[PDB]
Amino acid sequence: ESNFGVDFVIHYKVPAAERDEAEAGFVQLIRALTTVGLATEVRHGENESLLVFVKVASPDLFAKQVYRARLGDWLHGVRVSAPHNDIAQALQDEPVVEAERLRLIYLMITKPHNEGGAGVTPTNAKWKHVESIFPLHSHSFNKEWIKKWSSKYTLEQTDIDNIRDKFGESVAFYFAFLRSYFRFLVIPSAFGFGAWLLLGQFSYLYALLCGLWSVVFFEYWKKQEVDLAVQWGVRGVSSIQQSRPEFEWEHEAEDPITGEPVKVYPPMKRVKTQLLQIPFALACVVALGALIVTCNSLEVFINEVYSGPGKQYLGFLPTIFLVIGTPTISGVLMGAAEKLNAMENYATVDAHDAALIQKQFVLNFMTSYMALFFTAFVYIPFGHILHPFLNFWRATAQTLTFEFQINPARISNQMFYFTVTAQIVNFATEVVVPYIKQQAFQKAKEDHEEEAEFLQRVREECTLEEYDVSGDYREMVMQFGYVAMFSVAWPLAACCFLVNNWVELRSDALKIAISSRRPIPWRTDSIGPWLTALSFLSWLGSITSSAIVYLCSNSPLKAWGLLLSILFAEHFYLVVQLAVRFVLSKLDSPGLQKERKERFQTKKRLLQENEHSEKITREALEEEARQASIGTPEEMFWQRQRGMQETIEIGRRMIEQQLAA
Amino acid sequence: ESNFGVDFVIHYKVPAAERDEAEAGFVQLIRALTTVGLATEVRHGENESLLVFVKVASPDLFAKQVYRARLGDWLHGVRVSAPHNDIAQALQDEPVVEAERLRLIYLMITKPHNEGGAGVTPTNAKWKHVESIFPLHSHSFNKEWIKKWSSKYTLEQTDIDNIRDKFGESVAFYFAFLRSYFRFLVIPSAFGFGAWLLLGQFSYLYALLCGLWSVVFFEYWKKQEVDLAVQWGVRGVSSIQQSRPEFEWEHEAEDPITGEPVKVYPPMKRVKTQLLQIPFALACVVALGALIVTCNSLEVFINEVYSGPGKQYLGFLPTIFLVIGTPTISGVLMGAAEKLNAMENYATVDAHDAALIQKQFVLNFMTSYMALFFTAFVYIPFGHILHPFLNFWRATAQTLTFEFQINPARISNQMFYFTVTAQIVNFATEVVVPYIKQQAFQKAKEDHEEEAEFLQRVREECTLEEYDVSGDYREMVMQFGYVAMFSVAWPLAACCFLVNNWVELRSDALKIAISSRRPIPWRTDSIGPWLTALSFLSWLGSITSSAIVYLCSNSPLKAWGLLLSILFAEHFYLVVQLAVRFVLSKLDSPGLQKERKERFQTKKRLLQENEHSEKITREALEEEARQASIGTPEEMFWQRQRGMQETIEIGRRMIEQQLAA
Numbered sequence A, B: 001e002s003n004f005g006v007d008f009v010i011h012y013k014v015p016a017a018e019r020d021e022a023e024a025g026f027v028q029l030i031r032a033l034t035t036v037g038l039a040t041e042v043r044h045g046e047n048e049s050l051l052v053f054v055k056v057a058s059p060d061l062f063a064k065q066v067y068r069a070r071l072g073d074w075l076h077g078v079r080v081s082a083p084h085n086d087i088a089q090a091l092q093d094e095p096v097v098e099a100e101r102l103r104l105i106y107l108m109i110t111k112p113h114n115e116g117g118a119g120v121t122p123t124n125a126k127w128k129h130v131e132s133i134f135p136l137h138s139h140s141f142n143k144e145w146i147k148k149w150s151s152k153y154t155l156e157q158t159d160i161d162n163i164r165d166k167f168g169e170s171v172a173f174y175f176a177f178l179r180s181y182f183r184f185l186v187i188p189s190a191f192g193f194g195a196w197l198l199l200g201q202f203s204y205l206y207a208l209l210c211g212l213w214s215v216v217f218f219e220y221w222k223k224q225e226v227d228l229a230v231q232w233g234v235r236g237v238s239s240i241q242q243s244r245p246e247f248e249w250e251h252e253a254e255d256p257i258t259g260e261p262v263k264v265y266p267p268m269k270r271v272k273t274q275l276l277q278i279p280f281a282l283a284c285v286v287a288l289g290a291l292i293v294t295c296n297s298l299e300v301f302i303n304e305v306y307s308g309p310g311k312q313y314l315g316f317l318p319t320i321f322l323v324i325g326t327p328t329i330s331g332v333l334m335g336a337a338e339k340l341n342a343m344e345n346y347a348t349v350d351a352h353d354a355a356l357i358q359k360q361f362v363l364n365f366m367t368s369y370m371a372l373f374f375t376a377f378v379y380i381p382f383g384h385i386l387h388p389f390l391n392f393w394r395a396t397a398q399t400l401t402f403e404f405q406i407n408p409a410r411i412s413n414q415m416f417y418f419t420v421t422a423q424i425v426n427f428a429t430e431v432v433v434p435y436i437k438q439q440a441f442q443k444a445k446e447d448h449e450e451e452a453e454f455l456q457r458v459r460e461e462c463t464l465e466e467y468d469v470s471g472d473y474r475e476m477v478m479q480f481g482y483v484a485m486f487s488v489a490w491p492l493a494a495c496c497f498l499v500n501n502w503v504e505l506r507s508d509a510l511k512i513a514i515s516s517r518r519p520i521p522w523r524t525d526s527i528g529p530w531l532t533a534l535s536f537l538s539w540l541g542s543i544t545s546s547a548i549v550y551l552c553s554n555s556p557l558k559a560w561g562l563l564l565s566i567l568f569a570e571h572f573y574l575v576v577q578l579a580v581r582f583v584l585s586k587l588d589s590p591g592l593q594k595e596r597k598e599r600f601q602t603k604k605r606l607l608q609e610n611e612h613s614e615k616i617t618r619e620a621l622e623e624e625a626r627q628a629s630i631g632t633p634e635e636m637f638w639q640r641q642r643g644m645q646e647t648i649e650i651g652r653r654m655i656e657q658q659l660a661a
């Protein structure tokens, strides 16, 4: 139930084909680990691998490394004050959390020799046999965390702080984002319940309301994250650029700022494959669009022809099957997105991650909303254009066996089926399928007889995949997109997503608990490029919900109404965006006062670290001595009234002279 | 042609009604001036006033004050580095310009005793007889500056820097803004010339073009001003809050940041008179709107009735008279705006100035564009609603003497008459009327017989009004508004404004030269609240130019077209705003590199101001001695393979064992 003090575990798969070269890499690896002061320990890994175990046996060099990284943060404006202790007397002032300790150990194993480390990143260096470097998982904290999160109803800030001190900043930002989003989802849940009871289907007021809610939630989260970045001492980390190890280069050019020749790569070679996104984008758009329009034509052909013998529920069976098939096509889609992004040689890890978020968000946007767009914006306004598909299905099924009435409330049933089966498929794919996978490999399953269970748990933890938080961001961003631009089709969607988010805030916590190895703790200022995604989804929601409520509320479609509704709701979005930004500028979050007060008090301590007429007539006497040494008329003008009492009495007699005249 | 070294002149009007009290205030004034180390000198002022003259006779206390203000800038993040010289050996490192010197002297005469100064601001303190504190005007620089600006065609950056070193930062920001705006006006001048030749009246392409030009000009100026604020060492000054002297208060509450009890004022008392703007706003809107609709009805009645005996030029004579009357009504309008803003008790000078800019911009917006709005958006789409005014004028003029055909190209003639007579009225009111005023008071017009002409020039300089740069900002912002939202009515407006701006960049320079006393040099990071005005005017231009080109291009007015054109051009504005912001993020202005490079080099100098296996087995031996003193199984696990060569050979024999199995 407790580790052996091990901070990191390296896998180092030794295949039989390259045994001697992998042995030379092994001895070079453990040499390089011993140079940076890591006590090593070698144990057996299954299928010919060598689990080596590292730790800092030297607390003095560890505190020296901690002080060096704190100075590196202080140079880039991260820390408020310097450590001010080259000796370890600042560690008692500010302790090291487990996340900061594991991050600095990972930097000592990851950074190159110029940075003061033994860089053993797998693909770029010679270390092609280093499979995975990963920290361990403390089960005594894990079980307590899962139990205390399942027991409570709401989560305080101390729970997110306990996530911060043991899983880095990024996982804690995800849980803080999901907690704040779950708390803000109760407003359109209640208002959608009210609109589903009272206002009838497709109410305009709920469209304006969910637009306003998306604005206030996005701006409030953008305030709350800079508050959290002040509180965790991580504000401004995105200015620091981490050099990606797999970034190839050609030259080593002039110094930008520091004095160091940084390695460069010709950007036209980058744009040559940046433009590889565009034919891939158009190809994937038309492929998924042809699949979606084929599914839509098939379901309308089926519910026209069979006339619903069993149920009308059987009519949207192709839509249900398409949503079921959507995670499988999105798997190869994200694979071909990640391969394309990795081929696009990116300099720093921030830009590489941001481009991966952009490609993954575009592909998931298409495969999550193009069915509902073809339902709302194509099928409802003019649905006669898919009649060749209908007569094609008729001419095929007539040989195979040997009046359209486009319902405007088809989108409500479609959105209900979409939300429910997407909830079921997402819940099955997220936890239940890995639950039965780990229970299946549980029933399918020397070494010093005391450390046996420890090496058992490490050998089984090597097989798990590393937890990426990008996917759990993307799921919630898409759910927010459903809320922003399709809740007017089905106003109980916010209530369903509220229940899903309360289950999800424990479910994704369970995924980090037992279905994935502990992620390498990184620091981030924010959720990063997902803020652009939330902003774009809210802006598109203000257009789309209004056009949906006009086109489904529908008389012929008077296009004088549609453009006016789109214009009014989009300008209402812009006006409420200005209003909420102006209001949230005035709230005076306490972290800003704390940061600027500490900075001013430190520089005020530096400030404190750093008769009259006598002086005036003395300098006038000095200038008179310089005049008598020798330019002259201003000298006479200043030497008229030298003493101040002379000026007083001359001014008073001049008041008397001006009183005479 | 040269001063007597005088830095400041104080007027101190002594009326005969309060002669003894003003004399006591005089002796207290010159006492307080002598405490802060200012050599004083009293000369006669006309109509019973006492021009006292100050200077720093003590360069040591002046350099001490300079170092104190530089530390005050360094605490608030303005300066890159500290002065690092309590002795005056930093003044040789960075010299004092005349603007910084005069600003610090004005702070020594303006700041209270707690700040280390003798605060003699007129209305708040007892000094109700101090009329005006003002610096002098160096004519040898003035004549050279006017001559070298009239000789050149274009102005280099060195001219704006010579304005910066002698008139502060704010006047130099105005001249830099007018130079950059005059340089960017040549693009819609040439394109409007092309549209006026080729494309015919009311072209949509010119509307999209001037929208794009307004975007690129506004974003390029917003980049250029942070570049200039880096270069002049003034970046970040807007974070510093200057306490307004006339700000009344009730309490002196807790300390926000510094430690000082700041004085507070109940904000509900402020909102009580903030809401006095709204009935004043609605009253002024309906008053100017009734005047404009009366003028419009009168001119259409006149050109209907008389049928143009002389000319059609005589028909818009009421519009010409209304533009002529516009500076006179705007005078009392800005008076009642400034009185309302001064009644609204504002804490700091930044918020007070920003609210004055907001009120003045709203009133000048109405009186500059509501005539053209009632022409374009009311008279052209539906003009039958003003027929009661027409029959009213008929029923009056029928007793007084004893078919409408609304032309869509009426706005072109209106905009031409508006631009031309506004140019003529603005040029007459700006320079020519003060030119004949100063030549009229020239022909209408003891004391030691050597300083006679100096006291003559100071006595005549007291009568001039202090130059406010807000008015010369507001004129150009309104001209930019004409370009942004009405150039499609008359595409030569940009060419006319280009010629006007080339004349204006010397004319407003002449106004500071001889028609106004030298302004007290202030520091500002930017043009401030006018950036919101340019952004709002460009955004409204994207709507208004498109609606104008549809409604005047006009068939009946198909309102399916109007909303689509407004929507397309506004979203084109938003898309090109994103595009230009993304492009200008990548240009890498050199001032940012210079600032962050100097900051990193200073903190890197502070950074530089601040065997392996032996240590590893030594700490392992220490922990073994602690174990033998006595928790134990991890100790045994770490003490298995102590030395690194032991780990090497144990790992190699384990490779051999995994090779056996």
Ligand SMILES: [Ca+2]
Pocket: A426, A427, A430, A475, A504, A507
């Ligand atoms: Ca899930």
Ligand SMILES: [Ca+2]
Pocket: A430, A471, A472, A475, A504, A508
């Ligand atoms: Ca998830």
Ligand SMILES: [Ca+2]
Pocket: B426, B427, B430, B475, B504, B507
């Ligand atoms: Ca002018």
Ligand SMILES: [Ca+2]
Pocket: B430, B471, B472, B475, B504, B508
């Ligand atoms: Ca002007």
